[PDB]
Amino acid sequence: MMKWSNKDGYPWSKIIHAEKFFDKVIQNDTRPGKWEWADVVSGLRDLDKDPRMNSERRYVAIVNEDVGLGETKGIGITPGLFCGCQLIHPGEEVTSHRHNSVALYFIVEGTGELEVEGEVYSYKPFDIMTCPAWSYHAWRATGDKDTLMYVIHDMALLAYMRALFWEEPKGSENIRHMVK
Amino acid sequence: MMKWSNKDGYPWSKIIHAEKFFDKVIQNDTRPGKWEWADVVSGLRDLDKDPRMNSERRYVAIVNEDVGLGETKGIGITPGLFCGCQLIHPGEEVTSHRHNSVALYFIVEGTGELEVEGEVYSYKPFDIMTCPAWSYHAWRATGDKDTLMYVIHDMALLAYMRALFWEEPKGSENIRHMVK
Amino acid sequence: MMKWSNKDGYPWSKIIHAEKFFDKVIQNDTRPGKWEWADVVSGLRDLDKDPRMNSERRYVAIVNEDVGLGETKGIGITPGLFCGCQLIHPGEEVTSHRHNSVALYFIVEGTGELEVEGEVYSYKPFDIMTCPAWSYHAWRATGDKDTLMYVIHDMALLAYMRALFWEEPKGSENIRHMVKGS
Amino acid sequence: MMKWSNKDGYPWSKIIHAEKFFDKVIQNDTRPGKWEWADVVSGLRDLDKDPRMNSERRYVAIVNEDVGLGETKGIGITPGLFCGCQLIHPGEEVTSHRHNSVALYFIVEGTGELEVEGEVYSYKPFDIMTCPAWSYHAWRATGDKDTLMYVIHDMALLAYMRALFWEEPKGSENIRHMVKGST
Ligand SMILES: [Fe+3]
Ligand SMILES: [Fe+3]
Ligand SMILES: [Fe+3]
Ligand SMILES: [Fe+3]
């Protein structure tokens, strides 16, 4: 965890006036978000211009900036929901990993196989599949079209509570409590 | 909600790199918090030095500034928990209200009556009581010693989702969606 | 809220053994879920065989039964996510309503108009759109192909907390605190 | 994690009618809870009738049974908050552990030391202290009176999401994903 000192007391543990609490707690409203697939597809195909790019790092996140706290730019698609899209070229692999964040996958394009906890399934467009919290899961695109997926995850909720664990690549030595 | 416009597009609706998302979603760890009762009671007595202050506003938030997100000083006592303390003098009342946020009460000191949806209970030190989401509740402090309450609630969670409602004072025409 | 008595005290307010909390707090793990679009679409068609069906009631919930608490059937697609699909025939409307639950809409097929808080967008397939909590929103399907939507929402989370509100149809008198008996 | 088979398809993956869904998500309302400290203390003191009782297991949970899904006996104090109380005799210890659930401690009675990630703090009645998610923490009661603490936590939130981790005793080999099965 951390090397810290309480020998100067606890300056961070404070007591504030209800007006400051209330002023910080109430949020602006968020305008509706709209995103177009062409732009998502443009974004992701742009990722291939980077030499340092591979299949495991080829996600964009779909965000509504109004959703942020205070005046800050948010990263949720709504306040409590998070969403990303991913491109996998045929023949690419996303190797086994796990995280206690769950993921919800919707196949927009492409075919392939998904492996979770030793079992393979062969996917096709508009399949829906989940990778349960802390389940080992891996991808391989097949066929002649890129796999593009629309993904809902709660990684961010757990990050904010500081309860996110990730293990990539596979192997106990790779487990991390996900904090800066 | 809002008068708004899409006539110029949805500039707030965006698509971002996985590295930006990751960087904004991982949080700093949080040093343990410690608060002293004396400081809480002192904070509360201070408020009385406001002439324009009454029983319904006599609350302080207990915060651990580390639990903030990104650069924000936090207002939770932990990331996902929120705590307040409140002081009612004998013969004061917090009149009927409701909010969709729940509240959990620990009576540290004092006695009196809690009314929730038409039923009255007489509390004493170290009683524990809940005011269910959206239930009409009211307080009347009795005896000679001030009522001091230690309060756990989820008001901030609903506030962040923009899903929080507040009816004060009693009367459906007083309901507000709590944003702005 | 409710008429209730405490005259008999608080029998439901208990104190339980650590063993009992733990036996009840720890869940079974959950097998991964897999749904095929064809099962969804078939499901949505069946609903038209009902004469007492219209645009507004025409949704199915995609569920993972393993996700239940204790030994019960779950209602989530994951423990904390909720997923629905809806079908609107062209020329149908979903009338203006609001709820403090949020909705994330993916257009799989169809075209039409989304109205949110007085602003209209014309959607096409694979567009993504949100209806923020408690915003007035309305649907009208256009063109020739049915609109089919993949929808994620937090309604169940708010319901479990008993902090969910729903106003349908539009009008403050239609507001309900969504608990068994409204 | 899981020895499972998809060789017989995925029968748990269902599609249900809105009517069945709505019928299942909407819950009964919850009566207010009230609990009295005398009864809590009596509970905790009772537990010491068990001879194989120690400081690590001297907790009871404070529950509002109306809070459960369906007509089920729930275990939250509210739907989304969970509350326990614990008794530590002076000279007893809760040894180092960590869990990704947070804990919020209110000292009702007693005195002692709280250690979190190498730092000690000496506690007294009506002190408020947190043990952040995944921080090593340990207790030792001092003085001539039992430590009684009023504790709020989100262990159950995490348990339900199947995202709860627990390491007791200290040491990585003892980390568990907390699901029925894995310790
Ligand atoms: Fe993954
Ligand atoms: Fe209140
Ligand atoms: Fe709606
Ligand atoms: Fe602990």
Numbering used by the authors:
A (entry chain A), B (entry chain C): 0 to 179
C (entry chain B): 0 to 181
D (entry chain D): 0 to 182
What do the authors of the reporting publication say about this deposited model?
5-Nitrosalicylate dioxygenase (EC 1.13.11.64; 5NSDO), isolated from the soil bacterium Bradyrhizobium sp. JS329, is an enzyme involved in the degradation of 5-nitroanthranilic acid, which is produced biologically for an unknown purpose by Streptomyces scabies and also industrially in the synthesis of nitroaromatic products and dyes. The degradation pathway is initiated by hydrolytic removal of the amino group catalyzed by an aminohydrolase to form 5-nitrosalicylate, which is then oxidized by 5NSDO, which cleaves the aromatic ring with the production of 4-nitro-6-oxohepta-2,4-dienedioic acid. 5NSDO is a nonheme iron(II)- and oxygen-dependent enzyme that belongs to the third class of ring-cleaving dioxygenases as it cleaves the aromatic ring of 5-nitrosalicylate, an ortho-hydroxy-substituted carboxylic acid. The enzyme also catalyzes the oxidation of 5-chlorosalicylate, while it is not active towards gentisate, salicylate, 5-hydroxyanthranilate, 4-nitrocatechol or 4-chlorocatechol.
The crystal structure of 5NSDO from Bradyrhizobium sp. was determined at 2.1 Å resolution by the molecular-replacement technique using a theoretical model predicted by AlphaFold. The asymmetric unit contains one tetramer. Each subunit of 5NSDO folds as a monocupin domain (residues 81–152) which consists of eight β-strands organized into two four-stranded antiparallel β-sheets that are a characteristic feature of this superfamily (β-barrel). The tetramer is mainly stabilized by the long flexible N-terminal region of each subunit, which makes interactions with all three of the other subunits. The quaternary structure is arranged in such a way that the active metal sites are oriented towards the external edge of the tetramer. Comparing the 5NSDO structure with those of closely related ring-cleaving dioxygenases of the same class, for example SDO and GDO, we found that the active-site residues are poorly conserved, as expected from the unusual activity exhibited by the enzyme, which accepts 5-chloro­salicylate and 5-nitrosalicylate as substrates but not gentisate and salicylate. Specifically, the residues which interact with the 5-OH group of gentisate (Asp174 and Trp104) are missing in 5NSDO, explaining the lack of activity of 5NSDO towards gentisate. Arg127, which is supposed to facilitate the deprotonation of the substrate in SDO, is substituted by Tyr104 in 5NSDO, likely due to the lower pK a of the substrate hydroxyl group compared with salicylate. Unfortunately, in all four 5NSDO subunits electron density for the side chain of Tyr58 was absent, so it was not included in the model.
